[PDB]
Design a protein around this ligand. Structure first.
Ligand SMILES: NC(=O)c1ccc[n+]([C@@H]2O[C@H](COP(=O)([O-])OP(=O)(O)OC[C@H]3O[C@@H](n4cnc5c(N)ncnc54)[C@H](O)[C@@H]3O)[C@@H](O)[C@H]2O)c1
Ligand SMILES: NC(=O)c1ccc[n+]([C@@H]2O[C@H](COP(=O)([O-])OP(=O)(O)OC[C@H]3O[C@@H](n4cnc5c(N)ncnc54)[C@H](O)[C@@H]3O)[C@@H](O)[C@H]2O)c1
Lengths: 330, 330
């Protein structure tokens, strides 16, 4: 009775009942390929994984029985999907369990930068006494009127579109760059499109990343491209950490070129304020990779990922799969 | 000789040039009526004030020459407007310079409660290491899916309407209670209206205050009315401290009856985390009365307040005044 392994997790309680009758389900709690037990490498027919482990070409070669990998989540940058396909392994994601969570979190980050809600809380926790009106304007200095500001989205897929839909009512003028989209989405949703990243950076008061990390967009925001942003612009990144060169950003924040940054994701996670290139960088908001999370979203995606494995066993791979991201399979 | 005094401020630089040619402008920097210099009491024809000082009946009687009071801001709970009118003193506000600023800040608070952005930032500042996916769920525990939740607005005026316009796109179902509004606003803006406070509290997952503080709504949210709210509801107050009995809220938070509260305003300002009935209360966000502030908003309202004073001198009081809130005048 086929083995299905949950690679980088301990909890397996949603997935077991959905698959009890078809497969033996197990967890590895492996943070790296080295830690995966020999039995799983040899016999596992299916694997489920989060974002905290990476499977390279060499790693995927170590599995002697694997037929399908399912990412519990939308992102699949952490799996070499081209090597997977060449070795006869289908890779799937769960693209839509946490769209709205993520947009909501993104807007929250934007609003926190514009209205300084998080920093004002911090100022009070640090014990600042704000009595007079002059002191209010001092403490809240930089809090800005949103109406008229331009919000620039890099990547206008599921999360990007979701953010756009929320930004309009605050008076943001929304603009996007996505060089892979077909013509027309801009017209449907009544937003403006630009056709180079430079245009987007030149025109945006707040730039937010919503593109998937791929072969061609590592360090999209880098030493060069940051200099193309407006003086005193805002940067928001709830997409993936490798999209941003944190050394570049660090300097930009120190020199005032970027007024502030809000990051849910980082080059090196888990994030710490004591460590890394952003060590002593001012005007930084960070959260620990939570944009996706809600009780309801977590359950939805686990259930969906169990269902996908179920399809892979009962049907034919890759035709039966709902969300297979690698038809350069076989 | 006309004297115009800025009662509770030091900064006078926007107002002087607008009034240079008509009146002498002066500032008191008084935090209480006792601190206002004898000259201002005797000769001041006009006064401008913020929210940090109060004028009672007794206080207003000490002015031997005052004809007009202008609140730089929309709130006028801190001035006995009926006493003012009876003593021949017109009271005006600036009702619309900071509507969108406030709604933006309000939504930011709402989203901070639902997505825990500020508390996750705090958890990172405190040095929490969030490595595994299980640790992400743990630290972000309580982060909730918004779509489907009901947002209940108490007071559906300028700020309330502005929050409703923003909430829709997140999937909130918006409900309101405002017993002074005429029939029909509900229909115009496509939101539902309830006709008692109890019905609003019963049906709301998140309750947000947007009513002006008046004779009849002090401690609107009190020991009795909090018990009418749903188990695990959220409370947001960017309207006025005084609307909420902080002793009652404090116990509610400790007992879990309210899942979290975000307050920009407090019974006793300036707020401190070391002091008051909320001293050791869990799941609290507070900002130090900033919801109104932006560089652009602050300028607009000071300029408007100066222009109102200008009308009072040049024209007949109260007819020439744009936003006079007390026709029980003379
Ligand atoms: N922080 C979180 O918890 C969280 C949650 C969900 C998703 N995400 C991240 O956000 C990403 C986007 O999510 P999604 O479901 O909306 O993806 P999606 O498939 O719906 O959209 C991504 C878009 O990015 C575009 N794109 C790729 N490279 C680009 C580039 N260099 N410049 C501009 N556009 C580019 C693509 O064409 C695509 O339309 C995911 O891949 C994931 O990494 C993060
Ligand atoms: N946080 C801030 O710095 C900030 C900024 C602006 C306004 N405010 C406060 O918000 C309040 C409202 O602002 P606004 O400009 O929208 O005023 P508004 O006059 O346009 O709205 C007030 C509404 O609340 C209603 N209301 C009064 N008493 C009520 C009650 N007891 N129960 C339910 N509804 C009631 C009124 O009928 C009216 O429709 C003011 O008191 C103001 O001080 C705070």
């Amino acid at each position: 009775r086929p083995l299905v392994a949950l690679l980088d997790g301990r909890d397996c309680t949603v997935e077991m009942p959905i698959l009890k009758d078809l497969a033996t389900v197990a967890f590895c709690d492996a943070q790296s390929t080295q830690e995966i037990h020999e039995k799983v490498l040899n016999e596992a027919v299916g694997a489920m994984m989060y974002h905290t482990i990476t499977l390279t070409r060499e790693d995927l070669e170590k599995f002697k029985a694997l037929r399908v990998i399912v990412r519990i989540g939308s992102g699949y940058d952490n799996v070499d999907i081209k090597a997977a396909g060449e070795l006869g392994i289908a890779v799937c994601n769960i693209p839509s369990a946490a769209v709205e969570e993520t947009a909501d979190s993104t807007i929250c980050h934007i609003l926190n930068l514009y209205r300084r809600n998080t920093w004002l809380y911090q100022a009070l926790r640090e014990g600042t006494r704000v009595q007079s009106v002059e002191q209010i304007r001092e403490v809240a200095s930089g809090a800005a009127r949103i109406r008229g500001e331009t919000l620039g989205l890099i990547g206008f897929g599921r999360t990007g579109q979701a953010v756009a839909v929320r930004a309009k009512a605050f008076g943001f003028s929304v603009i996007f760059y996505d060089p892979y989209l077909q013509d027309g989405i801009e017209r449907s949703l009544g937003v403006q499109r630009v056709y180079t990243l430079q245009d987007l950076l030149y025109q945006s008061d707040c730039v937010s990343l919503h593109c998937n990390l791929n072969e061609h967009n590592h360090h999209l925001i880098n030493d060069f491209t940051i200099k193309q942003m407006r003086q005193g612009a805002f940067l928001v990144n709830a997409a993936r950490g490798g999209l941003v060169d944190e050394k570049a950003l660090a300097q930009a924040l120190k020199e005032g070129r970027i007024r502030g940054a809000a990051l849910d994701v980082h080059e090196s996670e888990p994030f710490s304020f004591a460590q890394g290139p952003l060590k002593d960088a001012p005007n930084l908001i960070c959260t620990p990779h939570t944009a996706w999370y809600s009780e309801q979203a977590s359950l939805e995606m686990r259930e969906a990922a169990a269902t996908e494995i179920r399809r892979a066993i009962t049907g034919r791979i890759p035709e039966s799969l709902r969300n297979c991201v690698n038809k350069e399979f076989f």
